[PDB]
C-alpha cells in the first residue's frame, strides 16, 4: 500500500511524485515511465525503477468464483447506490466496522448518510439488510426531503421509510456521548437496527475544545467516543458511519486515527464527486468517481 | 461488405428511400421481390432488381462440400453459446485466438451470455466446450454466482466444481482494469488450463473517468491500447476473449468480431453480426431462459 512504502526509494522523490499528482500505486503501475519522468522531474532510469517497483506492489490476486461466493455468504453489506463507490468499498458498508467519510462541505458526506439510512432498509437482494437506521444529527443536517426523494426513486413507501429511521439531535459533546451510551439499550430493545449514522462527530468536540491548546484533550475525548461507537458496532453486529468535515489534508508528525476504514471525498465537475480509500485493513487503495442526483447517490454519466 | 451503404453502383438518394421504406438490413433486401421493392420504395424497377442482386451477392453464400466442411471443423475448436441459432450465426461458436464483442442495451443479454460462456467453456469438445477454465473480470459488479449455478444445474454439472473453474476478480476502475489485464499474462502462463477470458463492460470505467466527447480521444487511445493487449493474449496463448460493451473523417475500432444484441418480446433477444471477417451478415434470435442461453420457441 501507499507510495511511502515502496522499496529502494529515496524519500526526496516520494515528494516530487505526490507534488506531481501521483498519489496511488495503481496510478504508477499503469503510468508510462517516459511521462512519469517528466511530470515529476525524476531520472529516466529512476522512473523505470519506481514503476517496476510499483508494478510488483500491486496486490492482483485472482480468486476463484467459488471462493468469492463463500465470501459473499460469509458477509453482508449495505450498498451505497453508486456501483463505482460500492466497488471501492469491496461491496458496500460492512457491519461490525466503523467507516468514516471525511471531506469538505458538499463533498457528499450528508447525501451519503441519508442514502445509507434508506438503502439499509432494502432486502439483501436489492442491496440492503432489511433493517433500521439510527441517525444522530450533530449540527442539524438531516433533511426529511432528501430521505423522501431517495425514497421515491426506489419506489418505496415514503412514510414507511421515514418510520424506519430513528432520529435524534445531539446538542453537545456530553449529549452526543450519553446518546451513544443509550444506544446499547435501543439496539438490544430493537435488533432490527443495523446502521448507526453519526454526522459530523468531531464537530462539538472542535467547538467545546478549540484550537491547538486543547487538541490533546479533544482527541483524547474524541477518540474515546469513537472507541465507544466501534465497540457497539462490533458487539451488536451493526454498521456505523461517521462523517467528519475537513478543508484539505496535505496532498494536492504522522497523526493517529481510530476509524477502521477512512474514505476521503472530494468535489469535482459540478455534479461529480471523487471517493478515495485512505485507511482500510482489507480494502485496496485507489479512488473512483460517483455523483449526486435527485434519486440520491448514483454512479456518474 | 455489410450495411446497405456499402452497395456498389448505388446512389445515395435511394439509400435513403430504402431505409425510409423499412429495408435496413441486407438479408432483407436479398430475399426481397424486386417488384415489391420497386413500389414500396418508389425506385425504378430496373434499379430494384439491381439493388437486390447486389445485396444478395453481399451475403456471400458459398456452397462447400460435406467433406470440406468436416475438415474445417477439426481445423478449429469453438465454445458453444447454448443456443443453436446463435452458434450458427457465430460459425460454430466463440473462437479462441480472437476477441469477440457483444454490445447492446441493458438486459439485451450480454451479461447472461458471459456467464453462459464461463460455464460452457469447461465442457469437453464433444459437448461444446474446450475443457478449460474461464477468467471473469467484473467491471461493474454484474457477476451472479446464482446464474452460474442454474446454468450449471441445467447441464447436470458439479455446481461447486464449475464455480471453482471460474476465476473472478473485481476491477474497480480503469487503472485497476488495466493492471489486472497486464497480470493476466502471468496467470495464463501460470495456468494453461484457462481458455476463456471475459471482461464485462470494458468501456464502462473509461466512460466514467474520461466523460464526454472531450476525452473520447484519450478514451479510445487507452481503450484501444487496453484491447490491443487483450487480443495479443488471446492470440498468443490460444484462448478466447470476450468483451461486452453497453451502448443505447475517423472512428477507431479494434475488436475482431462485434455482435450487436437487441431486446425482443419479453423472453426473446436478437443478435446481429455487425463486424466480422469470416462471419456472414444477418441477425438471428435466441432466448434467456432459467437454464441459461437457449433458443426461443
Give the DSSP letter string of A171-188. Answer: -SHHHHHHHHHHHHHHHH
Q: Is B148 on the interface with A (CB under 8 A)?
A: yes
Residues B166, A83: C-beta atoms closer than 8 Å: no
Contact B269, B286 (CB under 8 A): yes
| Inter-chain touch A84–B173, beta carbons under 8 Å | yes
Backbone angles phi, psi at B263, to 5 degrees: -90, 135
User: CB–CB of A288 and B173 under 8 A?
Assistant: yes
The sign one gets for the Cα dihedral B57, B61, B63, B68 is positive
Judge whether A70 is closer than 8 Å to chain B, CB to CB. Answer: no
Quote the cell numbers at residue A80: 451505497
Give B241's DSSP letter: E
| Residue B49 in grid coordinates | 432488381
The verdict on whether residue A203 carries a ligand-binding annotation is: no
Calculate the alpha carbon distances from B271 to A25, A230, B102, B103, B282 in Å. Answer: 41, 52, 9, 10, 9
Whether chain B has a CB inside 8 Å of the CB on A271: the answer is: no
Cell numbers at B194, concatenated: 484457462
Distance CA(B77)–CA(B240), nearest Å, equals 10
What is the signed CA dihedral for B9, B13, B19, B24, rounded to 10 degrees? 20
Q: What is the resolution of this structure in A?
A: 3.3
Q: Which cell is B157 given?
A: 454439472
Q: Do B164 and A65 touch (CB under 8 A)?
A: yes
| Summary count for chain B: helices (H), strands (E) | 13, 11
Domains contained in chain B, CATH given: 1-62 (1.10.150.20), 63-297 (3.40.50.300)
The number of C-alpha atoms within 13 Å of A55 and in the hemisphere containing its C-beta is: 15
The b-or-e profile of A47-62 (16+ CB within 10 A means b, else e) is: bebbbebbbebbebeb
Tell me whether residues A65 and B176 touch, CB distance under 8 A: no
Nearest to B215 by CA among A297, A300, A35, A293: A300
Per DSSP (E only), the strands in chain B are 78-79, 94-95, 99-104, 133-138, 166-170, 194-200, 240-245, 257-263, 268-275, 283-288, 293-294
CB contact, 8 Å: B202 with chain A?
no
State the structure-solving technique.
X-ray
DSSP character string of chain A: --GGG-TT--TTHHHHHHTTT--SHHHHHTS-HHHHHHHTT--HHHHHHHHHHHHHHS----EEHHHHHHHHHT--EE--S-HHHHHHTTTSEETTSEEEEEESTTSSHHHHHHHHHHHTTS-GGGTS-S-EEEEEESSS---HHHHHHHHHTTT--HHHHHHTEEEEE--SHHHHHHHHHHHHHHHHH-TTEEEEEEESSHHHHHHHS-STTTHHHHHHHHHHHHHHHHHHHHHHT-EEEEEEE-S--S---------SEEEEEEE-STTEEEEEEEE-SSPPPEEEEEEE-SS-EE---
CA distances from B243 to A77, A131, A229, B99 (A): 28, 37, 45, 7
Planar angle of CA A16, A20, A23, nearest 5 degrees: 90
Mutate to test the interface with A, among B115, B136, B208 (most CBs of A within 10 A): B208
Amino acid at each position: 500500500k501507499t507510495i511511502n512504502d515502496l522499496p529502494g526509494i529515496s524519500q526526496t522523490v516520494i515528494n516530487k511524485l505526490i507534488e506531481a499528482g501521483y498519489s496511488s500505486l495503481e496510478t504508477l503501475a499503469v503510468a508510462s515511465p517516459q511521462d512519469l519522468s517528466v511530470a515529476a522531474g525524476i531520472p529516466l532510469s529512476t522512473a523505470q525503477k519506481i514503476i517496476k517497483e510499483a508494478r510488483d506492489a500491486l496486490d492482483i490476486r485472482f480468486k476463484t468464483a467459488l471462493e468469492v461466493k463463500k465470501e459473499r455468504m460469509n458477509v453482508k453489506k449495505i450498498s451505497t447506490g453508486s456501483q463505482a463507490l460500492d466497488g471501492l468499498l469491496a461491496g458496500g458498508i460492512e457491519t461490525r466496522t466503523m467507516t468514516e467519510f471525511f471531506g469538505e462541505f458538499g463533498s457528499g458526506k450528508t447525501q451519503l448518510c441519508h442514502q445509507l439510512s434508506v438503502n439499509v432498509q432494502l432486502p439483501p437482494e436489492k442491496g440492503g439488510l432489511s433493517g433500521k437506521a439510527v441517525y444522530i444529527d450533530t449540527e442539524g443536517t438531516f433533511r426529511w426531503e432528501r430521505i423522501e426523494n431517495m425514497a421515491k426513486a426506489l419506489g418505496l413507501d415514503i412514510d414507511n421509510v421515514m418510520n424506519n429511521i430513528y432520529y435524534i439531535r445531539a446538542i453537545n459533546t456530553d449529549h452526543q456521548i450519553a446518546i451513544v451510551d443509550d444506544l446499547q439499550e435501543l439496539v438490544s430493545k430493537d435488533p432490527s437496527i443495523k446502521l448507526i449514522v453519526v454526522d459530523s462527530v468531531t464537530s462539538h468536540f472542535r467547538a467545546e475544545y478549540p484550537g491547538r491548546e486543547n487538541l490533546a484533550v479533544r482527541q483524547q475525548k474524541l477518540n474515546k467516543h469513537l472507541h465507544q461507537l466501534t465497540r457497539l458496532a462490533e458487539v451488536y453486529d451493526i454498521a456505523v458511519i461517521i462523517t467528519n468535515q475537513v478543508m484539505a489534508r496535505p496532498d494536492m508528525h504522522t497523526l493517529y486515527h481510530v476509524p477502521g476504514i477512512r474514505i476521503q471525498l472530494k468535489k469535482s465537475r459540478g455534479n461529480r464527486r471523487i471517493a478515495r480509500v485512505v485507511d482500510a485493513p482489507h480494502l485496496p487503495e485507489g479512488e473512483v468517481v460517483f455523483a449526486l442526483t435527485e434519486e440520491g447517490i448514483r454512479d456518474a454519466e
